[PDB]
Amino acid sequence: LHATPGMFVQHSTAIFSDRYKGQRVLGKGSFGEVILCKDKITGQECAVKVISKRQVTDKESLLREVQLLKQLDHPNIMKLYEFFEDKGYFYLVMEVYTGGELFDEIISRKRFSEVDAARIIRQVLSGITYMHKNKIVHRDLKPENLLLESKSKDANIRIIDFGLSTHFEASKKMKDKIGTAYYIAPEVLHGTYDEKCDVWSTGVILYILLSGCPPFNGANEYDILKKVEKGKYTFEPQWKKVSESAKDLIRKMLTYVPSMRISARDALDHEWIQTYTKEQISVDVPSLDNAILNIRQFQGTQKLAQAALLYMGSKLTSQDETKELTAIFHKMDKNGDGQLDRAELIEGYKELMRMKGQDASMLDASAVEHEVDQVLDAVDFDKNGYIEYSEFVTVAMDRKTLLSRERLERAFRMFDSDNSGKISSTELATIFGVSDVDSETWKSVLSEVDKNNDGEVDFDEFQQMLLLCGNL
Ligand SMILES: Nc1ncnc2c1ncn2[C@@H]1O[C@H](COP(=O)(O)OP(=O)(O)NP(=O)(O)O)[C@@H](O)[C@H]1O
Ligand SMILES: [Ca+2]
Ligand SMILES: [Ca+2]
Ligand SMILES: [Ca+2]
Ligand SMILES: [Ca+2]
């Protein structure tokens, strides 16, 4: 029973209009197709893409895209909350990003300084390192598909639009000639390729950030593709002030032969990306102490509670609500790939001890390793060996703060699929995407939670489960 944020995406049995209220339109696309909506229960704002069935094989491709978004949890990848379908429409309910496309920043300035470009490309590369590690290739990276989270000058980047994305395998190469002319890798046009195609597109973006201009240009799509296919580019007047390090990274990402082209991971490790700032994220002792405290108290959580907390943490908390936790996550993620590993958690504990002025030799040699092994197992909801962003936020967040009245109510209705007012073992099975929950799993829920002995969990019991007979 692996819990992931993606298991909640298509799980509601409710109709869209019973969960969301439309406000204003959003974006610069066809009018009314993306709408800012409010969650009727929590008040959470979201961006809804409404697709008419008149406008979509196409149904299959939309579903594939939803399936891919359900498998990705990363601070630089768009978050999908929910997906609804009715007789007339599909509704893609997404986290709202209000800073506009990177494309619009580009066309409103001459070019980016190296430091501003490095911050952007570092985030893109974190996103794609993570994607590639999860066997997913984007295939349409470009500035139109990179949204800034807000208008704040320090807004993060989110990779959007997975409409061309697919899984890839080591054994079988990809063949579909798919992409956008300025950004598409030559081997994609030749028709045999792998995930290095995303690295090339990111190299094109970087070249544009630093110069203002595409490396392969021309009067029309046909002319652009002819330059792309040859692969010849030049650093031809702005380039005189650009550092040798920046050029070196571009040379490596626009390396023509794909077997010789740098990987996303190695590009994330490039000296230009690694050393563009020495500024440290500010995290005070009390916030880190509290986060660690919360994480280490999580062992022993039963399966209904676990799924309910992950739902609330991964779907019902905004960026504003999780500011402090997000900073701690990025500080602990030493290799900047947007996932926490065993070695990174170990270092996080040693960091905390140093910060608190604790003497580390007062513990057994492997005390920290033993701690992290227990903690990691417990907090790794999908058991893939990493702490993803949403797993981290869920567990590290102050529990009383997470368990608001509205979040509790939303979470209960999400589990109670038939609206009977009680959660059954079979509703537990369905949320985890399995046929049946075994007797031991359900019995361990009931022995703690089923206070009236009826074999199901009502709203009262569900609140008490999470809150000392708490009820909001
Ligand atoms: N999660 C989001 N939050 C806020 N705005 C978004 C989000 N996703 C897309 N938009 C914007 O809504 C507009 C249309 O979105 P989308 O439906 O993705 O466009 P499209 O059909 O792919 N072609 P285009 O709209 O020209 O990019 C664009 O301005 C997007 O930037
Ligand atoms: Ca990491
Ligand atoms: Ca995990
Ligand atoms: Ca029920
Ligand atoms: Ca009961």
| Single-letter code of the amino acid located at 407 | R
What phi-psi label fits residue 257: left (phi over 0), alpha (psi between -120 and 50 degrees) or beta?
A: beta
Q: Whose CA is nearest to atom 26 of ligand 1?
A: 29
455 with 382, same domain: the answer is: yes
Q: Are 220 and 170 in a shared domain?
A: yes
Both 273 and 309 in one domain: the answer is no
d(CA 186, CA 230): 8
Do residues 213 and 204 lie in contact, with contact meaning Cβ atoms separated by under 8 Å?
no
Residue 28 Cβ < 6 Å to ligand 1: yes
Q: What is the distance of C-alpha 95 from the center of its chain?
A: 10
- Alpha-carbon Rg for the chain, nearest whole angstrom, is 24
Q: Quick one: 405 and 441 in the same domain?
A: yes
Structural tokens at position 102: 């990177």
Tell me how far apart the alpha carbons of residues 325 and 121 are, in angstroms, rounded to a whole number: 23
Q: Considering every ligand atom, which ligand is closest to the CA of 340?
A: 2
Alpha-carbon span 388 to 100, nearest angstrom: 26
For residue 214, how far is its CA from the centre of ligand 4 (angstroms)? 56
Burial degree of 286 (CB within 10 A; 0-12, 13-18, 19+) = exposed
Print the domain residue range for 311.
1-14+280-472
Contacts of residue 104, Cβ cutoff 8 Å, sequence gap at least 6? none
* Residues known to be catalytic: 140
Boundary (domain end) residue, out of 42, 71, 99:
99
CATH of the domain at 47: 3.30.200.20
Domain count of the fold of the chain? 3
Whether the CB-CB separation of 169 and 135 falls below 8 Å is answered with yes
Question: Is 194 within 8 Å of 168 (Cβ atoms)?
Answer: yes
Q: Is 391 annotated as a binding residue?
A: yes
Q: Are residues 90 and 104 in the same domain?
A: no
Pocket test for ligand 1, best of 26, 37, 89, 145 (most atoms within 8 A of CB): 26
Q: State whether the beta carbon of 27 lies less than 6 angstroms from ligand 1.
A: yes
> Same domain for 268 and 370?
no
Overall resolution, Å: 2.0
On whether both 44 and 19 belong to a single domain, the answer is yes
Please write down the HEC assignment for all residues of the chain. Answer: CCCCHHHHCCCCCCCHHHCEEEEEECCCCCCCCEEEEEECCCCCEEEEEEEECCCCCHHHHHHHHHHHHHCCCCCCECCEEEEEECCCEEEEEECCCCCCEHHHHHCCCCCCCHHHHHHHHHHHHHHHHHHHHCCEECCCCCHHHEEECCCCCCCCEEECCCCCCEECCCCCCECCCCCCHHHCCHHHHHCCECCHHHHHHHHHHHHHHHHCCCCCCCCCHHHHHHHHHHCCCCCCCHHHHCCHHHHHHHHHHCCCCHHHCCCHHHHHCCHHHHCCCCCCCCCCHHHHHHHHHHHHCCCCCCHHHHHHHHHHHHHCCCCHHHHHHHHHHHHHCCCCCCEECHHHHHHHHHHHHHHHCCCHHHCCCCHHHHHHHHHHHHHCCCCCCCEEHHHHHHHHCCHHHHCCHHHHHHHHHHHCCCCCCEECHHHHHHHCCCCCCCHHHHHHHHHHHCCCCCCCEEHHHHHHHHCCCCCC
Nearest CA to ligand 1 atom 15: 29
Q: Produce one character per residue of 56-70: b if its CB has 16 or more CB atoms within 10 Å, e if not.
A: eeeeeebeebbbbbb
Nearest to 310 by CA among 52, 76, 53, 6: 6
CA distance 252 to 194: 16
Spatial separation of the C-alpha atoms in residues 115 and 264, rounded to whole Å: 19
CA 195 to chain centre: 19
On whether the CB atoms of residues 319 and 149 are closer than 8 A, the answer is yes
Sign of the Cα pseudo-torsion (238, 240, 241, 243, in order): positive
297 and 445 in a single domain? The answer is yes
Instruction: Note whether 67 and 134 are same-domain residues.
Output: no
Ligand whose nearest atom lies closest to the CA of 334: 2
Structure tokens at 212: 């203002």
Q: Answer whether 405 contacts ligand 1 (Cβ < 6 A).
A: no
Residue 251's CATH number = 1.10.510.10
Boundary residue ending a domain (99, 117, 140) = 99
Domain check: are 270 and 143 in the same one? Answer: yes
Q: Does 335 share its domain with 457?
A: yes
Last residue of a domain, one of 231, 254, 279: 279
Q: Are 39 and 410 in contact (CB under 8 A)?
A: yes
Shared domain for 266 and 318, answered yes or no, is no
